[PDB]
Structure formats: C-alpha cells, structure tokens
Design an enzyme around this catalytic site. Structure first.
Site, mmCIF file in Angstrom:
data_model
loop_
_atom_site.group_PDB
_atom_site.id
_atom_site.type_symbol
_atom_site.label_atom_id
_atom_site.label_comp_id
_atom_site.label_asym_id
_atom_site.label_seq_id
_atom_site.Cartn_x
_atom_site.Cartn_y
_atom_site.Cartn_z
ATOM 1 N N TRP A 150 -9.812 -8.650 3.825
ATOM 2 C CA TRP A 150 -11.061 -9.424 2.421
ATOM 3 C C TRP A 150 -11.091 -11.055 2.215
ATOM 4 O O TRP A 150 -11.774 -11.510 1.288
ATOM 5 C CB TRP A 150 -10.168 -8.946 1.130
ATOM 6 C CG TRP A 150 -10.646 -7.428 1.084
ATOM 7 C CD1 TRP A 150 -11.484 -6.380 0.802
ATOM 8 C CD2 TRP A 150 -9.903 -6.272 1.869
ATOM 9 N NE1 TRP A 150 -11.274 -4.943 0.823
ATOM 10 C CE2 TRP A 150 -10.150 -4.852 1.062
ATOM 11 C CE3 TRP A 150 -8.509 -6.344 2.323
ATOM 12 C CZ2 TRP A 150 -9.320 -3.717 1.647
ATOM 13 C CZ3 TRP A 150 -7.506 -4.696 2.629
ATOM 14 C CH2 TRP A 150 -7.921 -3.685 1.601
ATOM 15 N N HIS A 210 0.228 4.234 -2.688
ATOM 16 C CA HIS A 210 0.292 5.814 -2.975
ATOM 17 C C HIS A 210 0.624 6.726 -2.199
ATOM 18 O O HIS A 210 0.633 7.797 -3.172
ATOM 19 C CB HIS A 210 -0.203 5.953 -1.029
ATOM 20 C CG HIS A 210 -1.840 5.370 -0.918
ATOM 21 N ND1 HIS A 210 -2.764 5.827 0.311
ATOM 22 C CD2 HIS A 210 -2.908 4.509 -1.248
ATOM 23 C CE1 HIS A 210 -4.409 5.228 0.376
ATOM 24 N NE2 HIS A 210 -4.079 4.697 -0.826
ATOM 25 N N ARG A 229 0.783 -0.886 -0.195
ATOM 26 C CA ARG A 229 0.350 0.195 0.003
ATOM 27 C C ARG A 229 0.644 1.217 0.025
ATOM 28 O O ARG A 229 0.826 2.652 -0.698
ATOM 29 C CB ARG A 229 -0.712 -0.171 1.024
ATOM 30 C CG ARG A 229 -2.252 1.545 0.771
ATOM 31 C CD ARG A 229 -3.386 1.323 1.978
ATOM 32 N NE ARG A 229 -4.390 1.884 1.501
ATOM 33 C CZ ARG A 229 -5.313 2.454 2.492
ATOM 34 N NH1 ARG A 229 -4.343 3.151 3.638
ATOM 35 N NH2 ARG A 229 -5.636 3.576 1.508
HETATM 36 C C1 HEM Z 1 -10.927 2.239 -5.670
HETATM 37 C C2 HEM Z 1 -9.742 2.094 -5.129
HETATM 38 C C3 HEM Z 1 -9.174 1.774 -4.039
HETATM 39 C C4 HEM Z 1 -9.559 2.500 -2.712
HETATM 40 C C5 HEM Z 1 -11.097 3.336 -2.959
HETATM 41 C C6 HEM Z 1 -8.926 1.556 -1.405
HETATM 42 C C7 HEM Z 1 -9.197 1.792 -0.007
HETATM 43 C C8 HEM Z 1 -8.592 1.151 0.612
HETATM 44 C C9 HEM Z 1 -8.987 1.149 2.559
HETATM 45 C C10 HEM Z 1 -9.865 2.448 2.430
HETATM 46 C C11 HEM Z 1 -7.684 0.530 2.299
HETATM 47 C C12 HEM Z 1 -7.816 0.205 3.962
HETATM 48 C C13 HEM Z 1 -6.783 0.891 5.367
HETATM 49 C C14 HEM Z 1 -7.308 0.817 6.269
HETATM 50 O O1 HEM Z 1 -7.548 0.684 6.926
HETATM 51 O O2 HEM Z 1 -5.810 0.276 6.855
HETATM 52 C C15 HEM Z 1 -7.279 -0.010 1.500
HETATM 53 C C16 HEM Z 1 -5.654 -1.024 2.177
HETATM 54 C C17 HEM Z 1 -5.276 -1.860 1.422
HETATM 55 N N1 HEM Z 1 -5.084 -1.496 -0.015
HETATM 56 FE FE1 HEM Z 1 -6.789 0.328 -1.053
HETATM 57 N N2 HEM Z 1 -8.307 1.277 -1.821
HETATM 58 C C18 HEM Z 1 -7.910 0.980 -3.536
HETATM 59 C C19 HEM Z 1 -6.683 0.866 -4.858
HETATM 60 C C20 HEM Z 1 -5.539 0.144 -4.562
HETATM 61 C C21 HEM Z 1 -4.817 -0.330 -4.713
HETATM 62 C C22 HEM Z 1 -4.857 -0.092 -6.567
HETATM 63 C C23 HEM Z 1 -3.439 -1.052 -4.163
HETATM 64 C C24 HEM Z 1 -2.384 -1.700 -4.584
HETATM 65 C C25 HEM Z 1 -1.906 -2.240 -5.913
HETATM 66 C C26 HEM Z 1 -4.183 -1.335 -3.080
HETATM 67 C C27 HEM Z 1 -3.237 -2.719 -2.008
HETATM 68 C C28 HEM Z 1 -4.196 -1.956 -0.028
HETATM 69 C C29 HEM Z 1 -3.483 -3.273 0.569
HETATM 70 C C30 HEM Z 1 -2.292 -3.691 -0.269
HETATM 71 C C31 HEM Z 1 -4.267 -2.530 1.407
HETATM 72 C C32 HEM Z 1 -3.878 -3.107 2.897
HETATM 73 C C33 HEM Z 1 -3.209 -2.311 3.800
HETATM 74 C C34 HEM Z 1 -2.825 -2.908 5.385
HETATM 75 O O3 HEM Z 1 -3.460 -3.943 5.588
HETATM 76 O O4 HEM Z 1 -2.203 -2.350 6.000
HETATM 77 N N3 HEM Z 1 -5.171 -0.435 -2.721
HETATM 78 N N4 HEM Z 1 -7.445 0.132 0.396
#
Ligand code: HEM
Length: 291
Positions: A188, A49, A45
C-alpha cells in the site's frame, strides 16, 4: 456466554513486559522475513484476525479463547499466511508457557505496532483458552472485493462505527498483499514496516488506476508501485469515510490516538473485565528501555 478475564496466576505488569520484550527482540532479529519487511505486519494481522471473528450478537468468536490454535480456524482461507505469525510466536510461547493463547496473539499485535513506531496501545491480560468446539466457523472475516456499504455493515458486527473503521484500516500502511495468499498483490505504500498515516495520504494523493492482477481480480494500482483493495478505495468513494480519511491524512497524532483506541477495543470485544481487574498495561518499547 460471558467471558470473564482471569489474570494468569500471580502475574503482573513485569511478567507481560518480559513477554513483550521477547516478541520485540525476535522482531528485531528475524528481519529477513517477507523480503525484509519483517514479521511486524503479519503479527498485527494475526491479532486482528484472531479478534475479528467476534459477533456482538452472541459473543461467539473474539480474542478471548485463542481458538486460532485449532485447525478449523488456522486453516480458514481468510487466514492464509498467518501461520507465519503463529510460527514466530511459538518459541515465545515455549519460553512463557503460562501466557494464554489469546493474550499472546493480541500482545503480538500490540508489540508489533509499538515496535514499528506506532502509538502506544494499552493492553489487558486475562484471556483464557477455550476448547476446540468453541472455535468459530470460517467466513466471519471480511471480503476485499466489496464496496463501502459492505464495509460499514460488516464492521457493525464488531461494534465499530465509521471513525473506528477508517482508523483501523490505517493498518494497511503495513506489509503487503500477496497474490498466492489473498488474490491481491502489492504494498500500500513505501513505509510498510514503520507505522504511519501513509495509507490515507496515498489514498488521497496517488493517481490510482483500476487494473486486473494476475489472479484476475480488480485492484487499484499506482505508478509508484502501490495498490489499494476495492474495500480500501471504498473509503474515498463514500463521502462519510472520505471526510475521515482526510482528517487522518492531515493529523498524524489524531490517527495515532484513534487507532490506539479502536485497536484496543477490537482486541477486547467480548471480554468482561471484573471491577477489580488490573488497569490496562502500557508497555515500554525496547528503545525506551535502552534494549
Ligand atoms: C474491510 C476490512 C479489511 C479487508 C477486506 C482486509 C483485507 C486484507 C487483504 C486481502 C490483505 C492481504 C493478505 C495477503 O495477501 O497477505 C490484508 C493484509 C493486511 N491487513 Fe487487512 N483487511 C481489512 C482490515 C484490516 C484491519 C482492520 C487491520 C488491522 C487493524 C488489517 C491489517 C492488515 C495487515 C497488517 C496486513 C498485511 C499483512 C502482511 O503483510 O502479511 N486489515 N488485508
């Protein structure tokens, strides 16, 4: 603004493989983080970002300048929690002070995907740190409470098409949402520190219910204890996205290949690679090296 990749002076593949390896060994060692999920997901992430602030219209933001190190960007509400990935990388940067910040943040993501048994992600060096006033304002990263039309339009700014969007979203197999961070709670799926196509399978095969979480936001929940964000669920509400979700749910290798390409692209938007730049590097995993 043109950002030309500039190889860190005198460095070559073996130098970056050593950085890879240091990241990978720390990923293995610091296994307790986030209730034993480990740092893989937050490093993925972080890479996304730090790259996903890019705007194709004027080449602002993007991975090149490593601007997350400045307080405006590290304190973006959208980035809540990524400080853990930054702190992970700090001892790596101290050991290898020659690597640029953008190269380190992006390499952290590559290393995490690969060490989590994901596809190989070719990676190119040469991001150069840029000054504090080049840091993009907050608000360029996506909202999670939105529909498919929002997601499609959002990702046009990153020059991603439907297939690239659906492929990139497969990274939500990894890690979890944390209520105090984003207002969403839960993983997820079950394999959340191994890179697989599980996100697509769970979208299609779980019985989802639209519920409110304890921050009063709607999310989709299953009896297995999994969740999907509204933007995740939008991938099966939109018929164009749905077809691609089914493709990846039914073809692990295709997902791996398409993810690899899209993730490299994401990490490279905004960068001009000179004609005589090195070819992209494909790092060996620790396992492949016997380490
Ligand atoms: C419409 C696009 C996206 C939205 C709105 C979104 C939203 C989110 C949200 C709300 C979280 C949870 C953050 C938390 O509470 O820790 C998250 C986690 C994460 N996202 Fe996304 N995301 C998007 C796209 C992506 C993309 C494109 C990737 C990378 C290729 C990605 C990788 C991750 C990963 C790996 C996590 C887990 C982080 C953790 O466990 O600390 N996301 N995302």
């Amino acid at each position: 603004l043109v950002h030309v990749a500039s190889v860190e002076k005198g460095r070559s593949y073996e130098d970056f493989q050593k950085v890879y390896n240091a990241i990978a060994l720390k990923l293995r060692e610091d296994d307790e983080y986030d209730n034993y999920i480990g740092y893989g997901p937050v490093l993925v992430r972080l890479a996304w970002h730090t790259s996903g602030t890019w705007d194709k219209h004027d080449n602002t933001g993007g991975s090149y300048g490593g601007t997350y190190r400045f307080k405006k960007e590290f304190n973006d509400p959208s980035n809540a929690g990524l400080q853990n990935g930054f702190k992970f990388l700090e001892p790596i940067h101290k050991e290898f002070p020659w690597i640029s910040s953008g190269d380190l943040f992006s390499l952290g993501g590559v290393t995490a995907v690969q060490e989590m048994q994901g596809p190989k992600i070719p990676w190119r060096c040469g991001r150069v740190d840029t000054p504090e006033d080049t840091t993009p304002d907050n608000g360029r990263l996506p909202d999670a409470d939105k529909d498919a039309d929002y997601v499609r339009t959002f990702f046009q700014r990153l020059n991603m098409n439907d297939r690239e969007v659906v492929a990139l979203m497969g990274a939500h197999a990894l890690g979890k949402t944390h209520l105090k961070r984003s207002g969403y709670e839960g993983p997820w799926g079950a394999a959340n520190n191994v890179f697989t196509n599980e996100f697509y399978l769970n979208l299609l095969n779980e019985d989802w219910k639209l519920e409110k979480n304890d921050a009063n936001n709607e999310q989709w929940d299953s009896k297995s204890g999994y969740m999907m964000l509204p933007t995740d669920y939008s991938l099966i509400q939109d018929p164009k996205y749905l077809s691609i979700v089914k493709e990846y749910a039914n073809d692990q290798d295709k997902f791996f290949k398409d993810f690899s390409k899209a993730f490299e692209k994401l990490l490279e938007n905004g960068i001009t690679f000179p004609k005589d730049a090195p070819s992209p590097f494909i790092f060996k995993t620790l396992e492949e090296q016997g380490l």
